[PDB]
Amino acid sequence: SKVAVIGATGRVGSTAAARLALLDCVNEVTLIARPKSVDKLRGLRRDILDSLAAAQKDAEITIGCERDDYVDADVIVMTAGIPQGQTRLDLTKDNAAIIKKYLEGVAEENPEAIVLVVTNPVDVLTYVALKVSGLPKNRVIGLGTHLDSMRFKVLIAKHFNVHMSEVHTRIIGEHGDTMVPVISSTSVGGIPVTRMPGWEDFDVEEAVREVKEAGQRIIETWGGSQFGPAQAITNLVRTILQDERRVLTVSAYLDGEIDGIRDVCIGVPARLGREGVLEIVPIELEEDEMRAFRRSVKVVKEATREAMEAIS
Amino acid sequence: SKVAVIGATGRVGSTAAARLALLDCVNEVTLIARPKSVDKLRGLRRDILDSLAAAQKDAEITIGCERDDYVDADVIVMTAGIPTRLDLTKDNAAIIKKYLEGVAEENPEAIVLVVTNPVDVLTYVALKVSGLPKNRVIGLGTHLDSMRFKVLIAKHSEVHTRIIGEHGDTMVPVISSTSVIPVDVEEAVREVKEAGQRIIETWGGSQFGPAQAITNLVRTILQDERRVLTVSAYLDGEIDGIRDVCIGVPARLGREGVLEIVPIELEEDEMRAFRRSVKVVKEATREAMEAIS
Amino acid sequence: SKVAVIGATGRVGSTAAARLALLDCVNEVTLIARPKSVDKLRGLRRDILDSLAAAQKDAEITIGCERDDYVDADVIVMTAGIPTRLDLTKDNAAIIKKYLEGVAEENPEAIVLVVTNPVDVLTYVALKVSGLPKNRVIGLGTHLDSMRFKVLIAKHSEVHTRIIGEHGDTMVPVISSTSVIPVDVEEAVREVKEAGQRIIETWGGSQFGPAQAITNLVRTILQDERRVLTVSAYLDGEIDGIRDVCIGVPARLGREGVLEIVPIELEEDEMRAFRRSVKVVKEATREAMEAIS
Amino acid sequence: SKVAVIGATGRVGSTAAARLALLDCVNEVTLIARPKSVDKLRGLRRDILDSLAAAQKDAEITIGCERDDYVDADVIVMTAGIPQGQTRLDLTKDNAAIIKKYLEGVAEENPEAIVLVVTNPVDVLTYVALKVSGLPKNRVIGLGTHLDSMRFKVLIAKHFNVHMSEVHTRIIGEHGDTMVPVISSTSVGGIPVTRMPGWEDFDVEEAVREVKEAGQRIIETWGGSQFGPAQAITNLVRTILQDERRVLTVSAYLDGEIDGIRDVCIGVPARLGREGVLEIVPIELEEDEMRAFRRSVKVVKEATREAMEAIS
């Protein structure tokens, strides 16, 4: 198995690459960056190889900077993105240009490649990546609200003082201010969270507000999320390369599987396997949850239209 | 168990804290940094917690700057270090003292893992200023050099090697204990000695290499695994009657720290090289201690 | 951490000890049995050690028969039990007393996990004879029934269920907290109630089921995982003002044992069924305590 | 992946099956026993399924009692054997009859099946299994001195008070009184054991004597090894189904890879993968070690000749 990380010189890309190289299912991690930055990857390669020696894990760490260095990869993780007088539309256009530059026409050379988009806006860029690459709709996904769900899982776990793995929550919709917390599918130790003593003392709105602002708050303090998305990326890649066929919230192309919504890449629960999105599970969203989703799909569709019009 | 990471805002500190928190034996990680770096720690704490949730792991992450925030830790990992060589040792030595002077008085059962370079010298400084027992203060030195040396031989998991002496130009590759079945070696050595500087000039400094090594050392301690690992430890005559020096040696590491310095049988040429290394480390150690006075 | 397994020569005891020793948090397992069974323990110790080496795990395995061999353990797992139902409870109750009477006096911070059936009654006996705090004595009861119930629904890993009440004919399947997303149920229940007896008449008795469950409970305790697990615990009015009874309930389990009995919201029919179960357990508990006097 | 355990009703077979079912690479464990014992496997199946529910591991547990219930398995573990006025030759003949009864002609129906023989004499019966089954020489192995090496590893670890995984030793030859401890390949923490302070205070002969007698001592006390071989079986199966390509002491067919020895199944270091024995690594045995091996191959060849003459 070959996993190429586009933008490995970056905060998320470097950490994702290091953790990805520890997975037993990953046999090669290719570090990809711009030509002038290849020298920076040489230092990262040696550093990761040292970490693998300490963990007694085997993995080949290669470096590249062209299409032929990663197009043949089983999974391509897109972590390249411009840093933050710039509106959200300008960032989307610049980052979209990077998506096209790297992923355009990948299907012609590798029709069986899976692309995991991390660059923000992940929902919009996940759609851009799918169209420029020409790959099937199930072989392109984005981190989406996967990380948002983990952040919401932290708050729930700490409130009940339970192990983090005891909480299972789910946030769908955009990776932004229109995300939709699915409380109906949130549980603590298999128990519906609504039936948990303490839920009444849990300020959902406040918690949901922290998750929405967590991305910006981390950038303003630490400089940007790093280990969170690195580990989330590792988990998604492991689920794919090992064909675990498990449902995970990711940004995927909708084709009428939920409320007949179509032609949009947004965060939804999808069963992931070696062949990508094996299916988009229909959820029993409540009235308010379904409404909030619709508003989220409208925002993503609008932003996606503006992004595609600019890539033209 | 509680692990404090002094210097958590740094390249190695931040990565070490993230990987330490994953360990099931580490129930709490305390991120310690200078007062002006509290904000960075608030963000790092949030990001580490997110990574634990993704990994199905758990750890209470706390932050602090004062002594009472980390003196009660079971393991204190020292990664704080400023960005001539003697001045660097002096400044770094003053950081060790400001953070660890008198830890034994408040927590006699604390263990310290020094990462700051020169690790061999600063391991000795941390022991003296803290007053802890000689078995409870170790440094991460030639162990990381052994990993880089393993990579090269692995190219030419089941390659096991060992390097002793200073974490610098006087390191002693122990070929007598390098088995893949026991085994340009001079070239490969020169590559390991320059591996650190070459990573600094490219990536900016080692990160995941030492982070994973720190994780392994802490796990070996907290779970009392009693593994024979190369660490910078105080010598009291276990090898060639050499005493009063902290340098990279094979030691059996467990919950009580250095359980015993394993007197590995070294060849004639390897033993002479270890004597030369001890001389350099002792000299540098004296200069650092004198400046701390 | 040290885990003692009283009854290690038995089907469940031997398997539990083998799987407990694998845990990285279990540094020592003490195999305890009757004096005439020391030989069996010497062989079992040798075989368990061999399994650890094959697994790349480690644990000091010790053997004993007297109190001083296991009273200093962090967790004491009680699997000793003879092969009418009232006589069995009385005999088993006398074993609990002979082994645990007065443990709190010598080790007040000990935790007991009762496996011997009737676990709900014997969990109460072990608490009273030992004198330990009510949060440090738990039993493995309806948890194993939840696992068998999960299998059936899993057929019709991501099926999570919960059964409360007695580990017997008065168990309360909590459908209100059974999510795969929340959910012949009467048939599936009857299968779980007879699952134990059907395994006894075929294989001779459950073994790997309870062994793995014991392992999970001990690991949850020793690593302070704070997981919401169904265990037989003393009630002091947390659910419907029910007090003075040990019965299967959802509890948050950590290093201090039962950290809190989680008052799960039960439906009307589910709450009435739990009241009926408590009555049976209380009655049986009184008869067992009276015989121990 | 399907792993069939012939003799799952037994001490080793039941425990091996339970642990094998926990491996992620094992998707189905088939419990095989004599027809009258199938009812006993029904209880074991439920018990193992419960253990899998507790471990949150997925695996299908099936029961069978005929060739068609296990011949299509990827790995067949032979743990069936008669219990101990019986000489070693009589046991070998009876157990050999069980080998033929189960494994004869398996290659015709499944040429890509791997057989792991555990029944003693494992060295002799490993050879019997290979011939009656007609499978290739690399698709049939036996536990051999693998367990003996683990037992010797315990004694070394306890002597130096080190973690068991820090010791790497190797015992070759027969799984009996002719085993050969390879001290040249024994190490503690990567250090040659000969260069370890304390080796002079380690009574090798005594330790080697305990390992040789450990099998009988356990039978006389506990009733028979159980978790030791169960875990060793699990490790071998995992190495195969995951194609780890790692060297492990096992009883394999020699074909001139070591000292030109041929036509014998005895304990030797072999790299195991999805295709079985990928190769028999030549070892740098010392003079005494090579001599002791030769004596061991002579005993196994003689016992194997007597066993084949009786199966005729």
Ligand SMILES: NC(=O)C1=CN([C@@H]2O[C@H](COP(=O)(O)OP(=O)(O)OC[C@H]3O[C@@H](n4cnc5c(N)ncnc54)[C@H](OP(=O)(O)O)[C@@H]3O)[C@@H](O)[C@H]2O)C=CC1
């Ligand atoms: N939940 C989520 O989906 C998350 C989203 N992200 C997104 O991931 C991306 C990476 O963030 P982060 O790693 O912190 O950013 P950094 O600025 O730390 O790294 C950016 C990376 O992109 C590369 N890069 C920058 N500009 C270009 C360009 N014009 N062409 C090619 N490569 C370029 C950089 O390489 P070089 O050395 O050449 O500059 C570097 O590897 C961002 O878009 C961010 O928004 C991040 C975390 C979480």
Ligand SMILES: NC(=O)C1=CN([C@@H]2O[C@H](COP(=O)(O)OP(=O)(O)OC[C@H]3O[C@@H](n4cnc5c(N)ncnc54)[C@H](OP(=O)(O)O)[C@@H]3O)[C@@H](O)[C@H]2O)C=CC1
């Ligand atoms: N032993 C080994 O094998 C290795 C050695 N090291 C050593 O570890 C140290 C850390 O390296 P690295 O993380 O890459 O360096 P960075 O510069 O990236 O981080 C340094 C850390 O120390 C803190 N710090 C810096 N100056 C001071 C000071 N005067 N007083 C207190 N705290 C201070 C920083 O906090 P702030 O945000 O306030 O600046 C930060 O947390 C170095 O000394 C390095 O040589 C590193 C890698 C491996």
Ligand SMILES: NC(=O)C1=CN([C@@H]2O[C@H](COP(=O)(O)OP(=O)(O)OC[C@H]3O[C@@H](n4cnc5c(N)ncnc54)[C@H](OP(=O)(O)O)[C@@H]3O)[C@@H](O)[C@H]2O)C=CC1
């Ligand atoms: N809670 C649950 O879900 C489960 C409950 N259990 C209960 O656990 C217990 C153990 O079951 P299992 O291991 O299958 O039974 P076994 O008969 O196989 O083992 C019984 C164990 O108890 C010892 N023992 C027996 N009688 C006495 C006595 N009078 N005094 C002291 N020790 C004694 C035996 O030692 P010796 O060699 O000396 O006979 C042996 O170690 C039983 O009471 C059983 O009901 C079991 C499975 C699951």
Ligand SMILES: NC(=O)C1=CN([C@@H]2O[C@H](COP(=O)(O)OP(=O)(O)OC[C@H]3O[C@@H](n4cnc5c(N)ncnc54)[C@H](OP(=O)(O)O)[C@@H]3O)[C@@H](O)[C@H]2O)C=CC1
């Ligand atoms: N290092 C090694 O290689 C080791 C070797 N072994 C060997 O493994 C074998 C299993 O030992 P163990 O599990 O303790 O033995 P047990 O007596 O406990 O179990 C024997 C198994 O074989 C079955 N069996 C017995 N006789 C026959 C027969 N005539 N035809 C078919 N099946 C039969 C039994 O089923 P049923 O219920 O029908 O009787 C049962 O499943 C032995 O030959 C033993 O020597 C064991 C451990 C280690």
Ligand SMILES: [Cl-]
């Ligand atoms: Cl983010």
Ligand SMILES: [Cl-]
């Ligand atoms: Cl990391």
Ligand SMILES: [Cl-]
């Ligand atoms: Cl370095």
Ligand SMILES: [Cl-]
């Ligand atoms: Cl087991």
Ligand SMILES: [Cl-]
């Ligand atoms: Cl039961």
Ligand SMILES: [Cl-]
């Ligand atoms: Cl044996």
Ligand code: NA
């Ligand atoms: Na790898």
Ligand code: NA
């Ligand atoms: Na942890």
Ligand code: NA
């Ligand atoms: Na252990």
Ligand code: NA
């Ligand atoms: Na499985």
